[PDB]
Coordinates of C-alpha atoms in Angstrom, one line a residue:
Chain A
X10 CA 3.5 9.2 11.5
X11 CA 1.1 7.1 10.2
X12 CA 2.4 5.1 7.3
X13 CA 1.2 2.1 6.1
X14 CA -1.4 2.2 3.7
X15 CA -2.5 -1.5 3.2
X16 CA -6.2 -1.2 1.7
X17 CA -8.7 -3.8 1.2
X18 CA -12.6 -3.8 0.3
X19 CA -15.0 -5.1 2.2
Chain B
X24 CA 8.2 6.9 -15.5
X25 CA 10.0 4.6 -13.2
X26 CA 10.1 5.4 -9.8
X27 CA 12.1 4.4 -7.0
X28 CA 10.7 3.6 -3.4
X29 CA 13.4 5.8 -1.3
X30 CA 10.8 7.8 -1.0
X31 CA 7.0 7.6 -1.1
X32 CA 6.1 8.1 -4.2
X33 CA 3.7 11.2 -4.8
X34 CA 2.1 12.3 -7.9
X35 CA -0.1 15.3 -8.4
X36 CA -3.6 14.3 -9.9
X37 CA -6.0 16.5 -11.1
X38 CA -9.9 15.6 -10.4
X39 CA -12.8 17.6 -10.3
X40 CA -10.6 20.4 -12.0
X41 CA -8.5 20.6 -8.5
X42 CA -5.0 19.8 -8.0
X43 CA -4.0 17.1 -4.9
X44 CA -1.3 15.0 -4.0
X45 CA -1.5 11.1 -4.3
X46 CA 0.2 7.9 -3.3
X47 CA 0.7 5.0 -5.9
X48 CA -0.1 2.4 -3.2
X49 CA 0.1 -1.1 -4.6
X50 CA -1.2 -2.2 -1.4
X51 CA -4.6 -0.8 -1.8
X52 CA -7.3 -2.6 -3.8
X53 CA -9.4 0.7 -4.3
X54 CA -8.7 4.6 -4.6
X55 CA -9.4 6.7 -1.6
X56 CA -9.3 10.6 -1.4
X57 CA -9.2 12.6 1.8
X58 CA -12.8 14.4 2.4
X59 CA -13.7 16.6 -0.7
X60 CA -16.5 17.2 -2.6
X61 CA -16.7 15.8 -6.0
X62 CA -19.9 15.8 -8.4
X63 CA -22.6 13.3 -8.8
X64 CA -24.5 10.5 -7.3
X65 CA -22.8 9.0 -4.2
X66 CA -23.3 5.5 -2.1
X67 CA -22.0 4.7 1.3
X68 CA -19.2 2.0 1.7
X69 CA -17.0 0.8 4.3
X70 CA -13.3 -0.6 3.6
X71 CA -10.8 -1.9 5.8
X72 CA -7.1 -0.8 6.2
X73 CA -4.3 -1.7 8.8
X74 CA -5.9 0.1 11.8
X75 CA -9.5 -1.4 11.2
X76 CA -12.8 -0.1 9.2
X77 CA -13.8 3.1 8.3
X78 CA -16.9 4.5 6.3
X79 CA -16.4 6.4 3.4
X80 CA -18.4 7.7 0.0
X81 CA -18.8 5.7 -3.2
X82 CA -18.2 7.6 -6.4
X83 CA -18.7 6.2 -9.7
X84 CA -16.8 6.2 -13.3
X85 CA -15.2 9.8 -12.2
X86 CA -12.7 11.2 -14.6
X87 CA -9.2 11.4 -12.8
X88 CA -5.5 12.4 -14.4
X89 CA -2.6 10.8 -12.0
X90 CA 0.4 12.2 -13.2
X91 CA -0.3 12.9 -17.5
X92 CA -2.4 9.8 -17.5
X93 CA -6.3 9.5 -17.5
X94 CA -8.1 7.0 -15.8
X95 CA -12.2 6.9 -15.1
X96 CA -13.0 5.1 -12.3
X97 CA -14.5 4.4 -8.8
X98 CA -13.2 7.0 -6.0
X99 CA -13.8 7.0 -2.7
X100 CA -13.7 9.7 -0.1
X101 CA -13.4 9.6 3.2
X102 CA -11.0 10.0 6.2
X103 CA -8.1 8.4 4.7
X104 CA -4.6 9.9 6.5
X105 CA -3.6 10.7 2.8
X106 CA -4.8 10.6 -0.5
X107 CA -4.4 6.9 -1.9
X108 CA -4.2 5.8 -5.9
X109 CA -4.9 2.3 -5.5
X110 CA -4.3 -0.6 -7.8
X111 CA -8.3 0.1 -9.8
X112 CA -7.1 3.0 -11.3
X113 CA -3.0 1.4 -11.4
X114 CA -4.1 -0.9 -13.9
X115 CA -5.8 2.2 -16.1
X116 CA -2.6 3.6 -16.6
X117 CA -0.2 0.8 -16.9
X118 CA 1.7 0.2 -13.9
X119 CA 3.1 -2.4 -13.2
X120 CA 6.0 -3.4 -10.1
X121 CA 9.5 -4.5 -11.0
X122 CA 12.5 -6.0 -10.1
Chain C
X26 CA 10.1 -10.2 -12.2
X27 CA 7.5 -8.0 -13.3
X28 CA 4.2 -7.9 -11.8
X29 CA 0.6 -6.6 -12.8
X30 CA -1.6 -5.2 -10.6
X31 CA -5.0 -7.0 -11.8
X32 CA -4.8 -8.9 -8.4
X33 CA -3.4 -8.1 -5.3
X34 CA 0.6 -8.4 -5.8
X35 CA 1.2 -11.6 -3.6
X36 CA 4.6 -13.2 -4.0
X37 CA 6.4 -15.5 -1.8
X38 CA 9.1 -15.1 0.9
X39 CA 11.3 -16.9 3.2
X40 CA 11.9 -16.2 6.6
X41 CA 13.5 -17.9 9.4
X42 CA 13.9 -20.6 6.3
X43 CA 10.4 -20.7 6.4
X44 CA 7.7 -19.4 3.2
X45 CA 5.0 -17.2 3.6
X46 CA 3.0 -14.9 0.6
X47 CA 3.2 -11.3 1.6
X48 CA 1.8 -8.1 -0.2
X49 CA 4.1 -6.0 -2.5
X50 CA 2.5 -2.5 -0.7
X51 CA 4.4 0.7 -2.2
X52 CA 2.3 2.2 0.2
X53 CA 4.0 1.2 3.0
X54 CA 7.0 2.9 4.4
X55 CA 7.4 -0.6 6.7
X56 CA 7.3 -4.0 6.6
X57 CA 4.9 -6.0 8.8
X58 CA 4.2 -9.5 9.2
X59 CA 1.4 -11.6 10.6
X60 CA 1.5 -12.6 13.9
X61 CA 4.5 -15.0 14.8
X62 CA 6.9 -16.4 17.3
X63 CA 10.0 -15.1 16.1
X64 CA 13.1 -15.3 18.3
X65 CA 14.9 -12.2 19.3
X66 CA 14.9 -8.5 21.1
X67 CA 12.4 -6.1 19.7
X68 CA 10.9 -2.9 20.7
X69 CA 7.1 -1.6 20.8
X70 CA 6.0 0.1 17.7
X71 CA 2.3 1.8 16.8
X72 CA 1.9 2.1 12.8
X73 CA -0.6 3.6 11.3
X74 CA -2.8 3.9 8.3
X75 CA -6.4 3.6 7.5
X76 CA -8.5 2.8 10.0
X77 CA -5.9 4.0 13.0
X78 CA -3.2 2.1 14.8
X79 CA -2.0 -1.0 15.4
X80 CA 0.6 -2.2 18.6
X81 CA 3.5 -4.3 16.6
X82 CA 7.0 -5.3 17.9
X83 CA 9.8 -4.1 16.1
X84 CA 12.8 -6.7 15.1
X85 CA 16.1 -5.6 14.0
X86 CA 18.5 -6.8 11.0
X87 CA 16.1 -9.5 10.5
X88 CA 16.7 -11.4 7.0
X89 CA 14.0 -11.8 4.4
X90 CA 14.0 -13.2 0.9
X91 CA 11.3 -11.5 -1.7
X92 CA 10.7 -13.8 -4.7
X93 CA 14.4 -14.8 -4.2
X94 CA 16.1 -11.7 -4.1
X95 CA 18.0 -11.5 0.1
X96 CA 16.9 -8.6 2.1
X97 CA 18.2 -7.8 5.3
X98 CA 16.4 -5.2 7.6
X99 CA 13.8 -4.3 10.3
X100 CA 10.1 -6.6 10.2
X101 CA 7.1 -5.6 12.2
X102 CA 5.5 -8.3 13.7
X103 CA 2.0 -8.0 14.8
X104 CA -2.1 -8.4 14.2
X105 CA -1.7 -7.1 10.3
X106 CA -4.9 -9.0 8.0
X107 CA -1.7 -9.4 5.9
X108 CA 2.0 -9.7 5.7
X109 CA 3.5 -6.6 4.3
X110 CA 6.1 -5.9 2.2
X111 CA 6.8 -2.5 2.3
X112 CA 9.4 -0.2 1.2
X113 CA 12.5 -0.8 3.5
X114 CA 12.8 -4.1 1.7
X115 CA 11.0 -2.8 -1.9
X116 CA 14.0 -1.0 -2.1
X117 CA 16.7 -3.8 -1.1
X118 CA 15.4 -5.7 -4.3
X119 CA 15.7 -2.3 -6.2
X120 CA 11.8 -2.7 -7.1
X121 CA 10.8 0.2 -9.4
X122 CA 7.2 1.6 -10.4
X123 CA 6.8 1.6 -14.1
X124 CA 4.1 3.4 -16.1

């Protein structure tokens, strides 16, 4: 299951 | 609260008048909500996560309450595999890692 | 320690002896590094998150330190933007969420 939720902005 | 990392820690937040469930995610610079409708203007954005790129909707200074506490702030929507509190709207309503 | 999330929470660990700065990511239920030659068996792993999947190879009972509290526990190796602390080892140092 998908679980890494590591985000960044452009 | 303080919360332990056992589990993944959910909230409920209330936006838009609707209930949803939402991750506290440290990891993520912004906020991003699975595909909903929310009022206002909108711009389109792209951000970047672990798997790549994705295009999502930019919304504005939006009222949102993550568990008891409000924030007003930018929240994006878009195909996100779960809805994401990231550290923009974090720092609204105190929190803070510790150890 | 306690950290504020006005910037990304970047801290320093030590593996293999060796110091890198990794992400503090509540978010994530794994922990994955940056590309590197580590020694050892591993398996193939796909994670997931925004964006899709990534191919990583899974390393077992692998030491860490986090700001200078030990860990001990399983590390993701592959093509990440960032190394990845993520709740295996969160929980090791008995980090907390506080708001």
């Amino acid at each position: 299951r998908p679980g890494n939720f590591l985000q960044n902005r452009p | 609260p303080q919360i332990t990392l056992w589990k993944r820690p959910l909230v409920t937040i209330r936006i838009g008048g609707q209930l949803k469930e939402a991750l506290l995610n440290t990891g993520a610079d912004d906020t991003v909500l699975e595909e909903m409708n929310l009022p206002g203007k909108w711009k389109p954005k792209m951000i970047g996560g672990i798997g790549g790129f994705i295009k999502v909707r930019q919304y504005d200074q939006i009222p949102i309450e993550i568990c008891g506490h409000k924030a007003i702030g930018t929240v994006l929507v878009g195909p996100t595999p779960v809805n994401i509190i990231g550290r923009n709207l974090l720092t609204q309503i105190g929190c803070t890692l510790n150890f």
